[PDB]
Amino acid sequence: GIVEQCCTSICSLYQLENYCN
Amino acid sequence: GIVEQCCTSICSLYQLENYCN
Amino acid sequence: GIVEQCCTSICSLYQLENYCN
Amino acid sequence: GIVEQCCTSICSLYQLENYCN
Amino acid sequence: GIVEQCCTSICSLYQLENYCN
Amino acid sequence: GIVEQCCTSICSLYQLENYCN
Amino acid sequence: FVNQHLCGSHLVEALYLVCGXRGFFYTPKT
Amino acid sequence: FVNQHLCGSHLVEALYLVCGXRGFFYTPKT
Amino acid sequence: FVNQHLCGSHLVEALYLVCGXRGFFYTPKT
Amino acid sequence: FVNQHLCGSHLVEALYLVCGXRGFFYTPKT
Amino acid sequence: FVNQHLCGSHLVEALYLVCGXRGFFYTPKT
Amino acid sequence: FVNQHLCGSHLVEALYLVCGXRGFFYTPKT
Ligand SMILES: [Cl-]
Ligand SMILES: [Zn+2]
Ligand SMILES: [Zn+2]
Numbered sequence A, B, C, D, E, F: 001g002i003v004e005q006c007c008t009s010i011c012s013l014y015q016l017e018n019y020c021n
Numbered sequence G, H, I, J, K, L: 001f002v003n004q005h006l007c008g009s010h011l012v013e014a015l016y017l018v019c020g021x022r023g024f025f026y027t028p029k030t
Helices: A002-007 A013-019 B002-006 B013-017 C002-007 C013-019 D002-006 D013-017 E002-006 E013-017 F002-007 F013-019 G004-022 H009-022 I004-022 J009-022 K004-022 L009-022
Strands: G024-026 H024-026 I024-026 J024-026 K024-026 L024-026
Touching (some): A002 A013, A002 J009, A013 J009, B002 B013, B013 G004, B013 H009, C002 C013, C002 H009, C013 H024, D002 D013, D002 I004, D013 L009, E002 E013, F013 L009, F013 L024, G004 G024, G004 H009, G004 J009, J009 J024, K004 L009, K004 L024
Antiparallel strands (some): G024 J024, H024 I024
């Protein structure tokens, strides 16, 4: 999920964009 | 849209629950 | 106080409203 | 009110201390 | 300035990188 | 740096102002 | 003459608190 | 609504949203 | 044509920092 | 962009900024 | 009739995420 | 003013408020 990938661990801009519409 | 209904005028916590998942 | 009830511990919406005017 | 004095125009940290408890 | 270019109209993450250090 | 003085440790308003232009 | 962008920022922070573990989808235009 | 620890400025925005037009009071201990 | 609601959000976050452990009361209308 | 843990409302504002006009979805687990 | 002050607040939070460890300088007027 | 750890976007909004019209610089280490 997004919380585990970007909050519990650091995640790049690209990875953050996997959650855009 | 939410932007149309809530940025033209104040929406309460109650009107916002509408837009939840 | 509010810090101990809602920050140090989780507190429901009802409990959060005990701090409204 | 604070909304009247600070939203019509910018209030500094100093003008804001006024509204503190 | 940033205020002039980005508050008159929306700036993207890309237009904002411009103002970085 | 600012992170070590004001984030890693508490820092007064005066100290926070050492970072103003 | 108002500003939608700045309002959106407020809107999504509010939905975060309101929706909780239920989550939400934010969709402006296309 | 959310179900987690609301702290700092985050607890105040939460109060701002929930309380609405009645306003609220933020007093850590006072 | 400005917006009070969005301004309030900013106002209460500022009072949080400004007032510190002293706290404050936020009151708009009634 | 930043390179740290983005959590809570902070993760959502981040999504708000990055995604832009395409919007986004915030679903902790759902 | 818009408001620069409130916009600035948004601007500096965005630069914080965008610039990351690179940092930035915020300068309005003089 | 507050008397606690100001970190992340929170340290920047703090600078935004305190510094005012003179602006400021945010450089974690640089
Ligand atoms: Cl705003
Ligand atoms: Zn705003
Ligand atoms: Zn935070």
